[PDB]
């Protein structure tokens, strides 16, 4: 049990680095397609104005 | 004069008053009466603290008793509310003296048509929380409402059922047996995709770890537990890691719509067959309901359908039979 | 129009989308805490949530937290369901706020609603709306009731739009059709200026209109 | 003589006054409730070495309740739940205060023309110093208290333990030897077979007493019994139901949660720092004691003692003793967190028993079945072997 | 009695071979696990700063 509490601790801990690398590459492109939705109506407005 | 009339005054208005049509008026009640009654109870503490007990067994027998009586409100749906949402220590009023004696056949009762499936996972909780004091022996009495809950018609239920169930493996009492089912029935639901139905189960995982824990975790659920974990790679004490060490839970929507059709339960051994094949010998197709099995089967396999899938496929297809015959009941109303 | 105090009916009505969008995704708290990464929406195409919505006289809660069955999002977050809150229509009549909020884990160890806004049950003269009111997003917060709610969600360019939008839909146009035309494009205009903007959180919040006068009855509290 | 009571569920000081010692069973319980915040319903008390309380006995009875051989209390919903022992500890108004009063002091600078005012706050730190000092005494008995209130449960344990063993090993050895007594049984279940017959071919003084039997234990009624008997009598069912009943007792055996580190080991060194947190308090009272000599010394050193930075030595030694005991009250409430600390590390152990404890309340359910059976499989040979030979 | 003590060890010894050395192993993919997962997380971290 005890060694299953410390590999529980180090394979959770690889995982959650992981899943950190994950969130933060799915938070990267929500950001990145809003960017080119703003940029396209950017410049559509730009053209008008 | 106060003494006196505490008690006396106090459960006659709370009666008198009583009778209301408004459900939420009578669960406003119930819960005020829990907190009269504690002030009836201070009210004797005083008492006999200031001027013998057998008047306050009376009272707290009363306390049961209208604890009880409460229960007996045709507003299912208010009762539970009021249950989930004040506690009160579950009317702290029998324990397992009687608080199991009465309250097991009062819930029971209460194994009505599912509309309110929420109502159901509630429920499940507040026998959780029955099973505070009441469950030491009837904890398997639970176990065949364990079973019942199983039939519970919400997912959303299921999830709450996860709850409920990291809940008793605190409580307990009953778990050995139904230990080891509930590990082996979830090693196949280990992928199921339900996002509030897989983390709550991730999250029972981590309780019944604690509860159970010891090397019995390891053979009795590392078995089940093998049935999703992708890697070895989780503090089972937690439920993200524990998750995350399982695979990525299999499309409930493609399921669904399978689920969605009729006469899958055929369709189900043509499945069971497909995964003999996969481990066995079936190399052939037999002559099924063809047009809709065979559309479904190469959907399915062509949306990609991996090896693991099979086998939890079939045992939460068991539950879907299940809740397909519920559905399909449902359907009289 | 009608009288509130006979009909005392239990609320129920029908589910919609939120326009705010999961952008929400606590950039920095992610790069905290390992449990948000379980978020529905952190780890979905698109993003359920468990949906909890409440009605309260002036802060004073009258129903429970109403949560929605079972329905799929974390691909597309369309949502065409019912719900049936647990507010009688004369049940706190008066002052009443809708409030609501969505549980999606804010984290494996995190799952639960962190969205919520206040609108009034009737309308800022007092009808009561049985239609589509989509609500003002208060994103990583959520509802609170109270007559001075701290996330308004029913009550400029758009409310221009808006408005001269209904007035005309009333019957208030002229013979004159050529406007209408110009005017839903003119309207295009407006609304894309308003998508451009950027920075807010939103959702559309559809009342589900009532078998009684079969529409998004206008009630009046009595 | 006033009741002396520790919640052994978290061994920490809640007496009782002498005004419940005389009164009812449920006096006790109810006092709890109230003067302690610890409800009834999920609650405990038991005698250490003892039997838990029943609803008649007084205290005595199983002589205890004293300020060092108190009875043992344990909220039932404290282990029901989580519930690392909450240490949710009272204002430290006394302590805020403590804190404040010695960051001034040590902020307090030399006095000069002051030293009167710095006596009356020294004499106060040093009173504050005393009474926290006992505080923390009283605290580290109530350790202690914890310690016995863990004794009480390893007593407990081993009494309920005890019981279940008794019912469980005595059905469980009767069958072993009921093997045999099984080929005997199965003998019995053949002329069973023919008792059925026989009746069959017997439809209907000492016989109307006989029938008289026969009126609550009918035929299928019996039949179903023996038929029952014997297939939950699986032998396995046992020997399963064996290893069960071991593993029910193991849960029970947790044998490092006793023996934890030598709990007195570590007491000694509490005690010990309790003794040496009431040698600073005396040694603050002496400071004090010092510090009246010495306006007494200023007073008449008009004279005789003309030299000078008298009032400036005060005045450091007063901060300086001050900085001394605060130094201490750091210890001390490292302490009062280490009480819960401690009383989560205990509350582990608890709920391992615990548990152990209601799972062998589902293994007692069934050993009050297997008690039923074995008496049912012996008391039927005899009175049904009577019936059947009809 | 002997039965009961067996009643005890058998399931004991149920376990022991069921707690499989398969972590046991898993405890040096930590090694190289860790300190590559660091270097992807600090750069993630940098990417979604910018």
Redesign the interface.
Same mark, same amino acid.
């Given at each position: 049990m005890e060694g299953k509490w410390i590999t529980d601790q180090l394979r959770w801990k690889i995982m959650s680095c992981k899943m950190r690398i994950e969130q933060l590459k799915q938070t990267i492109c929500k950001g990145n397609e809003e960017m080119e939705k703003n940029s396209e109506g950017l410049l559509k407005t730009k053209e008008k104005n | 004069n106060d003494i006196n009339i505490y008690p006396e005054y106090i459960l006659p208005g709370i009666a008198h008053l009583a009778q209301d049509d408004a459900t #939420?008026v009578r669960l406003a009640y119930a819960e005020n009466i829990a907190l009269l009654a504690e002030t009836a109870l *201070?009210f004797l503490?005083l008492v006999?603290?200031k001027n013998?007990?057998t008047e306050?067994?009376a009272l707290h027998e009363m306390v049961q008793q209208k604890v009880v009586t409460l229960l007996s409100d045709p507003e299912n749906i208010v009762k539970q509310?009021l249950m989930e949402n004040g506690i009160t *220590?579950l009317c702290?009023?029998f324990?397992r003296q009687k608080a199991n004696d009465v309250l097991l056949s009062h819930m029971i009762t209460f194994l009505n048509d599912k509309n309110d499936?929420?109502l159901r996972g509630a429920f499940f909780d507040s026998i959780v929380g029955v099973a505070?004091?009441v469950?030491?022996?009837s904890?398997?009495i639970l176990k065949p409402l364990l079973q019942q809950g199983l039939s519970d018609a919400?997912?959303?239920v299921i999830v709450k059922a996860l709850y409920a169930l990291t809940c008793m493996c605190?409580?307990?009492?009953?778990?050995?047996p139904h230990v080891y089912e509930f590990a082996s029935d979830i090693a196949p639901f280990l992928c199921h995709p339900?996002?509030?139905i897989r983390?709550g189960a =991730?999250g029972f995982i981590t309780v019944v770890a604690r509860?159970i824990?010891?090397?019995? =975790?390891?053979?009795?659920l590392?078995?089940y537990l093998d049935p999703y974990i992708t890697?070895? #790679? #989780?503090? #089972?004490? *937690?439920?993200? =890691?524990?998750?995350? =060490?399982l695979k990525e839970p299999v499309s409930r929507?493609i399921f669904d719509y399978a689920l969605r059709s009729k006469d899958i339960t055929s369709l189900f051994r043509h499945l069971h067959m497909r995964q003999k094949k996969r481990n066995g010998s079936l190399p052939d197709c037999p002559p099924p309901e063809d047009p809709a099995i065979a559309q479904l089967l190469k959907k399915l396999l062509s949306q990609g359908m991996t090896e693991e899938e099979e086998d939890k496929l079939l045992a939460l297809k068991d539950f879907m039979m299940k809740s397909n015959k519920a559905k399909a009941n449902i359907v009289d109303q | 129009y009608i009288y509130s105090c006979d009909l005392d009916i239990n609320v129920q009505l029908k589910i919609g989308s939120l326009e705010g969008k999961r952008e929400q995704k606590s950039y920095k708290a992610v790069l905290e805490d390992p449990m948000l990464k379980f978020s529905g929406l952190y780890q979905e195409t698109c993003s359920d949530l468990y949906v909890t919505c409440q009605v309260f006289a002036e802060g004073k809660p009258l129903a429970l937290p109403v949560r929605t069955s079972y329905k799929a999002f974390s691909t597309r977050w369309n949502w065409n369901e019912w719900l049936k809150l647990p507010v009688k229509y004369p049940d706190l009549p008066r002052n009443a706020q809708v409030a609501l909020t969505i549980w999606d884990v804010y984290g494996p160890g995190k799952a639960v609603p962190v969205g919520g806004t206040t609108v009034s049950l009737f309308g800022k003269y007092g009808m009561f709306r049985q239609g589509m009111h989509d609500l003002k997003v208060w994103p990583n917060v959520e509802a609170d009731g109270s007559e001075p709610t701290k996330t308004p969600g029913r009550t400029d360019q758009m409310s221009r739009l808006a408005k001269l939008t209904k007035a005309h839909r009333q019957g208030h146009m002229v013979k004159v059709d050529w406007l209408d035309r110009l005017t839903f494009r003119e309207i295009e205009m407006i609304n894309e200026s308003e998508k451009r903007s950027s920075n807010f959180m939103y959702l559309m919040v559809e009342f589900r209109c009532v078998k009684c006068d079969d529409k998004e009855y206008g009630i009046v509290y009595y | 003589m006033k009741l002396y009571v520790f919640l052994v569920n978290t061994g920490t000081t809640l007496t009782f006054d002498t005004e419940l010692t005389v009164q009812t069973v449920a006096d006790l319980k109810h006092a709890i409730q109230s003067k302690y915040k610890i409800a009834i319903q999920h609650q405990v008390l038991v005698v250490n070495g003892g039997e838990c309380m029943a609803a008649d006995r007084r205290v005595c009875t199983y002589s205890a309740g004293t300020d060092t051989n108190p009875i043992f209390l344990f909220n039932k919903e404290m282990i029901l739940c989580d519930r690392p022992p909450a240490i949710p500890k009272t204002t430290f108004s006394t302590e805020n205060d403590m804190e404040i009063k010695v960051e001034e002091s040590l902020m307090m600078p030399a006095v000069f023309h002051t030293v009167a005012s710095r006596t009356q706050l020294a004499l106060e730190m040093y009173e504050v110093a005393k009474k926290l000092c006992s505080f923390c005494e009283g605290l580290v008995h109530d350790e202690h208290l914890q310690h016995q209130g863990w004794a009480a449960i390893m007593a407990n344990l081993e009494d309920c333990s005890n019981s279940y063993q008794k019912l469980l090993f005595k059905f469980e050895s009767i069958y072993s030897n009921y093997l045999q007594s099984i080929e005997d049984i199965k003998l019995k279940l053949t002329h069973l077979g023919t008792a059925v017959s026989v009746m069959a071919k017997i439809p209907l003084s000492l016989l109307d007493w006989i029938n008289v039997q026969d009126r609550p234990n009918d035929v299928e009624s019996l039949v179903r019994k023996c038929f029952d008997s014997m297939s939950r009598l699986d032998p396995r069912i046992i020997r399963p139901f064996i290893a069960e009943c071991r593993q029910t007792i193991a849960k029970l055996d947790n044998q490092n949660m006793k023996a934890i580190k030598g709990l007195e080991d570590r007491l000694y060194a509490l005690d010990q720092m309790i003794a040496s947190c009431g040698r600073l308090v005396n040694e603050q009272k002496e400071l004090a004691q010092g510090f009246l000599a010495n306006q007494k010394r200023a007073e008449n050193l008009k004279d005789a003692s003309v030299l000078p930075d008298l009032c400036l030595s005060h005045a450091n030694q007063l901060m300086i003793m001050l900085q001394n005991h605060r130094k201490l009250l750091d210890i001390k409430q490292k302490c009062t967190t280490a009480k819960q600390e401690l009383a989560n590390n205990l509350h582990v152990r608890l709920k391992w028993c615990c548990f152990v404890m209601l799972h062998a309340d589902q293994d007692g359910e069934k050993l009050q079945a297997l008690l039923r059976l074995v008496i049912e499989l012996l008391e039927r040979v005899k009175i049904v072997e009577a019936l059947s030979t009809v | 009695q002997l039965n009961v003590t067996e009643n005890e060890c058998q399931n004991y010894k149920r376990c022991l071979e069921i707690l499989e050395q398969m972590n046991e192993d898993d405890s040096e993919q930590l090694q190289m696990e860790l300190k590559e997962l660091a270097l992807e997380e600090e750069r993630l971290i940098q990417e979604l700063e910018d």
């Amino acid at each position: 049990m005890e060694g299953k509490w410390i590999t529980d601790q180090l394979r959770w801990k690889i995982m959650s680095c992981k899943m950190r690398i994950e969130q933060l590459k799915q938070t990267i492109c929500k950001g990145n397609e809003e960017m080119e939705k703003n940029s396209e109506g950017l410049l559509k407005t730009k053209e008008k104005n | 004069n106060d003494i006196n009339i505490y008690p006396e005054y106090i459960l006659p208005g709370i009666a008198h008053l009583a009778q209301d049509d408004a459900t #939420i008026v009578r669960l406003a009640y119930a819960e005020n009466i829990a907190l009269l009654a504690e002030t009836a109870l *201070r009210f004797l503490e005083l008492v006999q603290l200031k001027n013998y007990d057998t008047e306050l067994q009376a009272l707290h027998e009363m306390v049961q008793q209208k604890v009880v009586t409460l229960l007996s409100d045709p507003e299912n749906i208010v009762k539970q509310t009021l249950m989930e949402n004040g506690i009160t *220590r579950l009317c702290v009023f029998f324990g397992r003296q009687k608080a199991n004696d009465v309250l097991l056949s009062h819930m029971i009762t209460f194994l009505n048509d599912k509309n309110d499936w929420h109502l159901r996972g509630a429920f499940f909780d507040s026998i959780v929380g029955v099973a505070a004091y009441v469950g030491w022996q009837s904890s398997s009495i639970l176990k065949p409402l364990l079973q019942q809950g199983l039939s519970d018609a919400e997912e959303f239920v299921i999830v709450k059922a996860l709850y409920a169930l990291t809940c008793m493996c605190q409580l307990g009492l009953l778990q050995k047996p139904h230990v080891y089912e509930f590990a082996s029935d979830i090693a196949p639901f280990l992928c199921h995709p339900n996002l509030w139905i897989r983390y709550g189960a =991730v999250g029972f995982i981590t309780v019944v770890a604690r509860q159970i824990s010891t090397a019995d =975790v390891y053979c009795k659920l590392m078995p089940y537990l093998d049935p999703y974990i992708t890697q070895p #790679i #989780i503090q #089972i004490e *937690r439920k993200l =890691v524990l998750l995350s =060490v399982l695979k990525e839970p299999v499309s409930r929507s493609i399921f669904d719509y399978a689920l969605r059709s009729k006469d899958i339960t055929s369709l189900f051994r043509h499945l069971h067959m497909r995964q003999k094949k996969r481990n066995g010998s079936l190399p052939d197709c037999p002559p099924p309901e063809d047009p809709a099995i065979a559309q479904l089967l190469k959907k399915l396999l062509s949306q990609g359908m991996t090896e693991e899938e099979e086998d939890k496929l079939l045992a939460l297809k068991d539950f879907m039979m299940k809740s397909n015959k519920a559905k399909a009941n449902i359907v009289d109303q | 129009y009608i009288y509130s105090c006979d009909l005392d009916i239990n609320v129920q009505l029908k589910i919609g989308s939120l326009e705010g969008k999961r952008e929400q995704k606590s950039y920095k708290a992610v790069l905290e805490d390992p449990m948000l990464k379980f978020s529905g929406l952190y780890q979905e195409t698109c993003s359920d949530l468990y949906v909890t919505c409440q009605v309260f006289a002036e802060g004073k809660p009258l129903a429970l937290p109403v949560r929605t069955s079972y329905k799929a999002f974390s691909t597309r977050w369309n949502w065409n369901e019912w719900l049936k809150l647990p507010v009688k229509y004369p049940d706190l009549p008066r002052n009443a706020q809708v409030a609501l909020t969505i549980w999606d884990v804010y984290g494996p160890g995190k799952a639960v609603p962190v969205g919520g806004t206040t609108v009034s049950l009737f309308g800022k003269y007092g009808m009561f709306r049985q239609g589509m009111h989509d609500l003002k997003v208060w994103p990583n917060v959520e509802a609170d009731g109270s007559e001075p709610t701290k996330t308004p969600g029913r009550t400029d360019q758009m409310s221009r739009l808006a408005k001269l939008t209904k007035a005309h839909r009333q019957g208030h146009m002229v013979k004159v059709d050529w406007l209408d035309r110009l005017t839903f494009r003119e309207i295009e205009m407006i609304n894309e200026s308003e998508k451009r903007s950027s920075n807010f959180m939103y959702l559309m919040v559809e009342f589900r209109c009532v078998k009684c006068d079969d529409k998004e009855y206008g009630i009046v509290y009595y | 003589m006033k009741l002396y009571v520790f919640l052994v569920n978290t061994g920490t000081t809640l007496t009782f006054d002498t005004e419940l010692t005389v009164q009812t069973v449920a006096d006790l319980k109810h006092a709890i409730q109230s003067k302690y915040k610890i409800a009834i319903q999920h609650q405990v008390l038991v005698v250490n070495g003892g039997e838990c309380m029943a609803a008649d006995r007084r205290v005595c009875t199983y002589s205890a309740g004293t300020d060092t051989n108190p009875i043992f209390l344990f909220n039932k919903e404290m282990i029901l739940c989580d519930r690392p022992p909450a240490i949710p500890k009272t204002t430290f108004s006394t302590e805020n205060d403590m804190e404040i009063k010695v960051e001034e002091s040590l902020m307090m600078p030399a006095v000069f023309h002051t030293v009167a005012s710095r006596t009356q706050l020294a004499l106060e730190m040093y009173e504050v110093a005393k009474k926290l000092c006992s505080f923390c005494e009283g605290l580290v008995h109530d350790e202690h208290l914890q310690h016995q209130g863990w004794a009480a449960i390893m007593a407990n344990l081993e009494d309920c333990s005890n019981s279940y063993q008794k019912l469980l090993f005595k059905f469980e050895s009767i069958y072993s030897n009921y093997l045999q007594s099984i080929e005997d049984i199965k003998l019995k279940l053949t002329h069973l077979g023919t008792a059925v017959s026989v009746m069959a071919k017997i439809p209907l003084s000492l016989l109307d007493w006989i029938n008289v039997q026969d009126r609550p234990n009918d035929v299928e009624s019996l039949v179903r019994k023996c038929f029952d008997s014997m297939s939950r009598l699986d032998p396995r069912i046992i020997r399963p139901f064996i290893a069960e009943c071991r593993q029910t007792i193991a849960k029970l055996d947790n044998q490092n949660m006793k023996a934890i580190k030598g709990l007195e080991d570590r007491l000694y060194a509490l005690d010990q720092m309790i003794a040496s947190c009431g040698r600073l308090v005396n040694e603050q009272k002496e400071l004090a004691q010092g510090f009246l000599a010495n306006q007494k010394r200023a007073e008449n050193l008009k004279d005789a003692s003309v030299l000078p930075d008298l009032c400036l030595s005060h005045a450091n030694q007063l901060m300086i003793m001050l900085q001394n005991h605060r130094k201490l009250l750091d210890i001390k409430q490292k302490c009062t967190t280490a009480k819960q600390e401690l009383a989560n590390n205990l509350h582990v152990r608890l709920k391992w028993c615990c548990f152990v404890m209601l799972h062998a309340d589902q293994d007692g359910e069934k050993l009050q079945a297997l008690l039923r059976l074995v008496i049912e499989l012996l008391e039927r040979v005899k009175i049904v072997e009577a019936l059947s030979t009809v | 009695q002997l039965n009961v003590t067996e009643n005890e060890c058998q399931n004991y010894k149920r376990c022991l071979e069921i707690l499989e050395q398969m972590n046991e192993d898993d405890s040096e993919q930590l090694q190289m696990e860790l300190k590559e997962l660091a270097l992807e997380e600090e750069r993630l971290i940098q990417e979604l700063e910018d």
